[PDB]
Design a protein around this ligand. Structure first.
Ligand SMILES: [Mg+2]
Ligand SMILES: [Mg+2]
Ligand SMILES: [Mg+2]
Ligand SMILES: [Mg+2]
Ligand SMILES: [Mg+2]
Ligand SMILES: [Mg+2]
Ligand SMILES: [Zn+2]
Lengths: 100, 177, 84, 67, 115
RNA sequence: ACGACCAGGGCUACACACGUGCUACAAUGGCGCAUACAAAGAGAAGCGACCUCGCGAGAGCAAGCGGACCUCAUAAAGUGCGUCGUAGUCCGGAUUGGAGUCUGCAACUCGACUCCAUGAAGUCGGAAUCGCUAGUAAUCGUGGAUCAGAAUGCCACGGUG
RNA sequence: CGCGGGGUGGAGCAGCCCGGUAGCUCGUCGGGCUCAUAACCCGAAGGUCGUCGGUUCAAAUCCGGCCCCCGCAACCA
RNA sequence: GAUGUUCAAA
């Protein structure tokens, strides 16, 4: 069922890009600001009317090659096992076994 | 006798007009209000029956009467002559004092209310109702009683018909559905 | 706890249905899956059946209930006892 | 009535949040103060529901203002 | 020594005696001594039960002893009547904050009980 | 339909046992004050100083930094001072009530932290059993990854020894 | 009927005489040791002693009543 | 220094 989870993750990054920069920041700040009153209440209402998948917290970091939820490292964008094999094939630049 | 003085001043003439009686005596009245508690755990814990009796003694001033079982029954594991229930019959001014108290305080104090069944009459004009929680009466202090039991209130009335009985209680402004 | 600045939390569908019932008088229970919504004074004296995974469980709102969440009263798991 | 066996029964004055005061003969022995009476009850043809009365509901309102 | 509260504080360091008093913590002890101005670095001489007279009135502004206990009782009885999950843990002697019951919940459940 | 899209719940339930940790059982210690040092590492949907307010967790304002420069974030036992004077204790912290902060659409189940109050067990642990031969155990702090938020774990680092 | 003995943890057996607050054996339950099992080890629970009175600061203990079992002897309305 | 049975063919 890995493909279905990936199909969802591509929808979540698409919708978040669609909505994060258009309304997410403004609705949060006009709710947070102390000077704003009454409108901060209305702002929360329209926020819940949104799809809710836009939230960046709905996104879960996953390897591109093997779509694996756990073991993901941001810098390589790969799961731990994928990073190890790629490093030995020389695919990852500057990555060597570490001794100290 | 707060609800009594009201009855003989306003209720009597109210029922008199809408029924076209020939005599004031014909107008129905409330004879007695028996309050009944039943403890099926009396055989298990005789102390619980005493506590229930103490609750009824608080609810109504008259001291409670312990009802022994009428006949031995196999299903309920009871034997004849064994104390099982607790009953008080109120017939005097104390009947009116309980009646005015029940409508003014106990019925509002019930948690969720949707009306009292007008249909719940014995068919001889005598209204019988059931109380789910004894704590509704303010007599017993809340959280000062072991368990929340219940009681059964019966309004024996002179009325020979349910229709006469409902109007008598309705005239008192009883909370019918 | 939600921050005081953000105010109380309520769901649009829940609040809209509550206002739709109050204007038309109490008549039927509001069946909702919103356990996150806070108990509000506007919905006191009404039976809101907050959803429990298997089936909604009816709750009658009271004054002491306000200041607590709808789900907080509702059962969320069944564990009668370890013994049969 | 038989002497001694019956609980003591004197008159008490029970007050209400709505302001209605009822003189009732009861065995409480103390003047308790109640919240709901027949007059302030929605079913007893109440015009104003108990929602108007304060309590911890008002305390919730002071903390969260939705005007 | 005695204080406005029902319980009697011990004769020793004043701050410690107040910590022992129910309802008054060490930090609250420092709060009222800041108002009273009585420090332990003053002359130990001329110390009498008469001196705590100022303590009697200032502590009375804080619910303590029986007053706090009444508040705790009303808070828990409400929980029981509410039908809320918080009240139910109180009734069953189980953790009321969400701590794991599987293990390490001895303080709430009590001594170990055989199957 | 052993496919898939959703909302709520569960993986945190709990008579109970075990494994591995943490915090203790104090006085070589607790509390209060004064004062001293690290090394390693991370940062742009990010580190965020300073300043103002809040007991505080924090909020606002906003410098700088793609980094030997700015920012976390400066250490802790240590030393010097006073008190406790051996008591379930100025030990120890569970637990619980009340209130607030922050993340996040939202903290009810089911986050962390702060404050106010509460002060359980524990006065060093049965049979038995584990780790370690030198900067090693022992002890005391610091950072990282994972990460919206969520360490007592984990990968590193230094301190005393 | 007389004399003597016995009844104590689930079971069994001490303790009794000579009153000092009640144990053991085996079983049970939990843990340990062992690759595993037994043995073994540790911890735990269990009756205040057939019952009822008396005595006394105090009773399994001492003296009686009663119940059941057993041994031997006794028994010509 | 107690006890620990067995195992079709390719
Ligand atoms: Mg595949
Ligand atoms: Mg996530
Ligand atoms: Mg879902
Ligand atoms: Mg798990
Ligand atoms: Mg110690
Ligand atoms: Mg984090
Ligand atoms: Zn009223």
């Amino acid at each position: 069922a890995k493909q279905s989870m990936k199909a969802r993750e591509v929808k979540r990054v698409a919708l978040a890009d669609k909505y994060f920069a258009k309304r997410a920041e403004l609705k949060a700040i006009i709710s947070d600001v102390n000077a704003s009153d009454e409108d901060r209440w209305n702002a929360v209402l329209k926020l819940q009317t949104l799809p809710r998948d836009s939230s960046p917290s709905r996104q879960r970091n996953r390897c591109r090659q093997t779509g694996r939820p756990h073991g993901f490292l941001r810098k390589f964008g790969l799961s731990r096992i994928k990073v190890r094999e790629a490093a030995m094939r020389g695919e990852i630049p500057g990555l060597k076994k570490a001794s100290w | 006798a707060k609800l009594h003085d009201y009855y003989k001043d306003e209720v009597v003439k109210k029922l008199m007009t809408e029924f076209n009686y020939n005599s004031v005596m014909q107008v129905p009245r409330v004879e007695k209000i028996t309050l009944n508690m039943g403890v099926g755990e009396a055989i298990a814990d005789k102390k619980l029956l005493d506590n229930a009796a103490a609750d009824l003694a608080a609810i109504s001033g008259q001291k409670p009467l312990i009802t022994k079982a009428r006949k031995s029954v196999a299903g309920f594991k009871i034997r004849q002559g064994y104390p099982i229930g607790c009953k008080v019959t109120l017939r005097g001014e104390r009947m009116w004092e309980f009646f005015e108290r029940l409508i003014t305080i106990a019925v509002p104090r019930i948690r969720d209310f949707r009306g009292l069944s007008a249909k719940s009459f014995d068919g001889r004009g005598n209204y019988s109702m059931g109380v789910r929680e004894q704590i509704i009466f303010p007599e017993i202090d809340y959280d000062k009683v072991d368990r929340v039991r219940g009681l059964d209130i019966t309004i024996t009335t002179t009325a020979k018909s349910d229709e006469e009985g409902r109007a008598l209680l309705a005239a008192f402004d009883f909370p019918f559905r | 706890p939600r921050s005081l600045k953000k105010g109380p939390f309520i769901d649009l569908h829940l609040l809209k249905k509550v206002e739709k019932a109050v204007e038309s008088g109490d008549k039927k229970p509001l069946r909702t899956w919103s356990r996150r919504s806070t108990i509000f004074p506007n919905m006191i004296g009404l039976t809101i059946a907050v959803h429990n995974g298997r089936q909604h469980v009816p709750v009658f709102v009271t004054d002491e209930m306000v200041g607590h969440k709808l789900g907080e009263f509702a059962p969320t798991r069944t564990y009668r006892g370890h013994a049969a | 009535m038989k002497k001694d066996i019956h609980p003591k029964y004197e008159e008490i004055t029970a007050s209400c949040s709505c302001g209605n005061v009822m003189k009732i003969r009861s065995t409480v022995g103390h003047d308790l103060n109640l919240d709901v009476c027949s007059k302030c009850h929605p079913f007893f043809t109440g015009k104003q529901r108990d929602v108007a009365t304060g309590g911890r509901v008002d305390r919730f309102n002071k903390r969260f203002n939705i005007p | 020594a005695r204080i406005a509260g029902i319980n009697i504080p011990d004769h020793k360091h004043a701050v410690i005696a107040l910590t022992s008093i129910y309802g008054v913590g060490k930090t609250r002890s420092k709060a009222i001594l800041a108002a009273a101005g009585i420090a332990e670095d003053v002359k130990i001489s001329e110390l009498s039960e008469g001196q705590i007279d100022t303590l009697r009135d200032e502590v009375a502004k804080f619910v303590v002893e029986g007053d706090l206990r009444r508040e705790i009782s009303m808070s828990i009885k409400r929980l029981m009547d509410l039908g809320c999950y918080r009240g139910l843990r109180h009734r069953r002697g189980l953790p009321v904050r969400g701590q794991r019951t599987k293990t390490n919940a001895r303080t709430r459940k009590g001594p170990r009980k055989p199957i």
